[PDB]
DNA sequence: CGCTGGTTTTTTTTTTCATGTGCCGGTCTCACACGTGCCTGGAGACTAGTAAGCGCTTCTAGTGGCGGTTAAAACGCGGTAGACAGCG
DNA sequence: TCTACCGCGTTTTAACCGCCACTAGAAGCGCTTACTAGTCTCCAGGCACGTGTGAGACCGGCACATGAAAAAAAAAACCAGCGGTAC
């Protein structure tokens, strides 16, 4: 006899937890690598204020969290509980982010 | 009040017209209207249909499981 | 290159949780990475463009802030 | 007794009106609606005829656009028929509402 | 009967058809009127505000154009 | 036989278990807060130059209303295709 | 399965139109003069640089929310056994 939570019960717990908090949810280094990597394509031997990288992260996480809200609604609107790529795509299409 | 959800189905499908089959929701509606019935009757007719499908006595002409149309001994 | 994978499944899961998402298709993690990349490309491109115009080699917070405002994603608390 | 199947004319209509550019609301009833709404902000206001036309162009444009987005929300719910909840979603996601 | 009723079912149907809608619930026609009214309220309010600031009693095309730009619904072909 | 009574099964409930989250009292650290002295930017007062307010004119447009057409709306009819709800 | 949407045909509605006449009011000209700029001075209020203190951030622990699985009770779906009936 072991203990198990039903699929979804922890999901809910996680939601409550992360809504409650404000801390950045992507690991700071892997992000910073991704930034520099993308920046290379525009100009090589570029330096970044640490604050500039943090600004980018805040903006990115914010953006995605928001996109997920909208995506979630698109899922539910299709009588689903599970978000899928077509949920995101709809959200971005309606937002005028993509054709 | 009224027994043999088996006899209940048979009496609702008798009354129901000569068809390719007879679909649950059309029998569920007949049994609830014609006899002193409960709530879990909808969920007992669902168990009543599956035991009659099981015994070869009723057989289903279209669909699968307990959403579809069912026929009697020929 | 390909640090995009550094944006781990569990990290995306976390972001979605803050977005009030309960269940998440497997396909979403790659889809999200794609979106996140386009976002950063667009913002950074503009940020760097500000940097170049200031004849600097160091991207400032302000460079990003100005970029985000341009993109209509105004950001408070980095010198707005 | 020729009869077209439900939807066949719908399609014909779509093709027709997509093809064209003419304003699809009747000019006078709109113009009345404009002046009426304007009254609530300031009384005895005059309008250049061009100003009223601008408003109509902008309105029809806006709605046509909203319907596109609504249509997608309907389909996304495996429906062909747009419903208020389709519009509401579209406006919510657009950041028009809440 | 408010002039809002002057926005006839068939007119809405037409707009939806240009939007590539095939089938339309009955409830939509009133819902649409509601939306259309909010749109005009918001645009006209701003337009009139420009008019009042110009100490005029006649709303000009430009008054609308400026209003629509403010609302992020830039309109070409009426000046500005 | 039709009854009918009690009992077999399906539901709901209570429960128990367990677990995790929230809270207090005691603790460390650092960002808040404030305080110094110095600098710059504000305010100041003066002068002149200008922009705009105000009244006058012109002229335009926009409004209101004319006959009546003919198109469009609008109504109700009747019949499918799709909404939708359940199942597996 | 059920109906509410479409596509059809008749009855009602009203928008459109091509025109005119009359005006409010938009727009533009000249005056005045009241305001704002742009100069030289003086000054303090707000900036950086640097101090130390309290708040909040952390810890553990024990008390409270919760969800899950399990024991108990209820509701309702049925077998017999029976009395009663005509054999
Ligand atoms: Ca230099
Ligand atoms: Ca009012
Ligand atoms: Ca009014
Ligand atoms: Ca007047
Ligand atoms: Ca008037
Ligand atoms: Ca405490
Ligand atoms: Ca601390
Ligand atoms: Ca239905
Ligand atoms: Ca009907
Ligand atoms: Ca002093
Ligand atoms: Ca001081
Ligand atoms: Ca300081
Ligand atoms: Ca302090
Ligand atoms: Ca018996």
UniProtKB/Swiss-Prot annotation, chain A:
The modification Phosphotyrosine is found at residue 5. The modification N6-acetyllysine is found at residues 20, 43, 79, 86. The modification N6-crotonyllysine is found at residue 20. The modification N6-glutaryllysine is found at residues 20, 43, 79, 86. The modification N6-(2-hydroxyisobutyryl)lysine is found at residues 20, 28, 43, 86. The modification N6-succinyllysine is found at residues 20, 43, 86. Keywords: Acetylation, ADP-ribosylation, Chromosome, Citrullination, Disease variant, DNA-binding, Hydroxylation, Lipoprotein, Methylation, Nucleosome core, Nucleus, Phosphoprotein, Ubl conjugation. The modification N6,N6,N6-trimethyllysine is found at residues 20, 43. The modification N6-lactoyllysine is found at residues 20, 43. Acetylation is generally linked to gene activation. Acetylation at Lys-86 (H3K122ac) by EP300/p300 plays a central role in chromatin structure: localizes at the surface of the histone octamer and stimulates transcription, possibly by promoting nucleosome instability. GO terms for molecular function: cadherin binding; DNA binding; protein heterodimerization activity; structural constituent of chromatin. The modification N6-methyllysine is found at residues 1, 20, 28, 43, 86. The modification N6,N6-dimethyllysine is found at residue 43. The modification Phosphoserine is found at residues 21, 50. GO terms for cellular component: extracellular exosome; extracellular region; membrane; nucleoplasm; nucleosome; nucleus; protein-containing complex. The keyword Nuclease does not apply. The keyword Lipoprotein applies. Transmembrane segments: none annotated. The modification Phosphothreonine is found at residues 44, 71. Belongs to the histone H3 family. The nucleosome is a histone octamer containing two molecules each of H2A, H2B, H3 and H4 assembled in one H3-H4 heterotetramer and two H2A-H2B heterodimers. The octamer wraps approximately 147 bp of DNA. Interacts with TONSL; CHAF1A; CHAF1B; MCM2 and DNAJC9. Interacts with NASP; NASP is a histone chaperone that stabilizes and maintains a soluble pool of Histone H3-H4 dimers. It is linked to Glioma: Gliomas are benign or malignant central nervous system neoplasms derived from glial cells. They comprise astrocytomas and glioblastoma multiforme that are derived from astrocytes, oligodendrogliomas derived from oligodendrocytes and ependymomas derived from ependymocytes. This is Histone H3.1.
From Swiss-Prot, chain B:
Transmembrane segments: none annotated. Residues 1-74 form the H15 domain. It is found in: Nucleus; Chromosome. Coiled coil: none annotated. The modification Citrulline is found at residue 19. Induction: Both the unedited and the RNA edited versions are induced by butyrate (at protein level). Only RNA edited version is induced by DTT, vinblastine or TNF (at protein level). Belongs to the histone H1/H5 family. Histones H1 are necessary for the condensation of nucleosome chains into higher-order structures. The histones H1.0 are found in cells that are in terminal stages of differentiation or that have low rates of cell division. This is Histone H1.0. The lineage of its organism: Eukaryota, Metazoa, Chordata, Craniata, Vertebrata. The gene is H1-0. The chain holds residues 24 to 97 of 194 of the full protein.
Swiss-Prot record, chains C, E:
The gene is H4C1. The chain holds residues 24 to 103 of 103 of the full protein. This is Histone H4. It is linked to Tessadori-Bicknell-Van Haaften neurodevelopmental syndrome 1: An autosomal dominant disorder with onset in infancy, characterized by poor overall growth, microcephaly, hypotonia, profound global developmental delay, impaired intellectual development, poor or absent speech, and characteristic dysmorphic facial features, including hypertelorism and abnormal nose. Other variable neurologic and systemic features may also occur. Tessadori-Bicknell-Van Haaften neurodevelopmental syndrome 2: An autosomal dominant disorder characterized by poor overall growth, microcephaly, hypotonia, profound global developmental delay, impaired intellectual development, absent speech, and characteristic dysmorphic facial features, including hypertelorism, abnormal nose, and wide mouth. Changing residue 18 to H: Found in a patient with a neurodevelopmental disorder; uncertain significance; results in early developmental defects when expressed in zebrafish embryos. Changing residue 10 to A: In TEBIVANED1. One of its GO terms (molecular function) is RNA binding. Acetylated as part of spermatogenesis progression prior to histone-to-protamine exchange. Demethylation is performed by JMJD6. It comes from Homo sapiens (Human). The modification N6-(2-hydroxyisobutyryl)lysine is found at residues 9, 22, 37, 55, 57, 69.
């Amino acid at each position: 006899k072991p203990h198990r939570y039903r699929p979804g019960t922890v999901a809910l717990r996680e939601i409550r937890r992360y809504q409650k908090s404000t801390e950045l949810l992507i690991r700071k280094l892997p992000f910073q690598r991704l930034v520099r990597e993308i920046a290379q394509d525009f100009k090589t031997d570029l330096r970044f204020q640490s604050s500039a990288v943090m600004a980018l992260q805040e903006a990115c996480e914010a953006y995605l969290v928001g996109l997920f809200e909208d995506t979630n609604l698109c899922a539910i609107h299709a009588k689903r509980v599970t978000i899928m790529p077509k949920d995101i795509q709809l959200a971005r299409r309606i937002r005028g982010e993509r054709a | 009040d009224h027994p043999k959800y088996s006899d209940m189905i048979v009496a609702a499908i008798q009354a129901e017209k000569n068809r390719a089959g007879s679909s649950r929701q059309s029998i569920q509606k007949y049994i609830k209207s014609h006899y002193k019935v409960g709530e879990n009757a909808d969920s007992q007719i669902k168990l009543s249909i599956k035991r009659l499908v099981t015994t070869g006595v009723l057989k289903q002409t279209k669909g699968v499981g307990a959403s579809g149309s069912f026929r009697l001994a020929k | 290159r390909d640090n995009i994978q550094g944006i781990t499944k569990p990290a995306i899961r976390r972001l979605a949780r803050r977005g009030g998402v309960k269940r998440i298709s497997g396909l979403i993690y790659e889809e999200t990475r794609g979106v996140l990349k386009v976002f950063l490309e667009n913002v950074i491109r503009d940020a760097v463009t500000y940097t170049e115009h200031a004849k600097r080699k160091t991207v400032t917070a302000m460079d990003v802030v100005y970029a985000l405002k341009r993109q209509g994603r105004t950001l408070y608390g980095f010198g707005g």
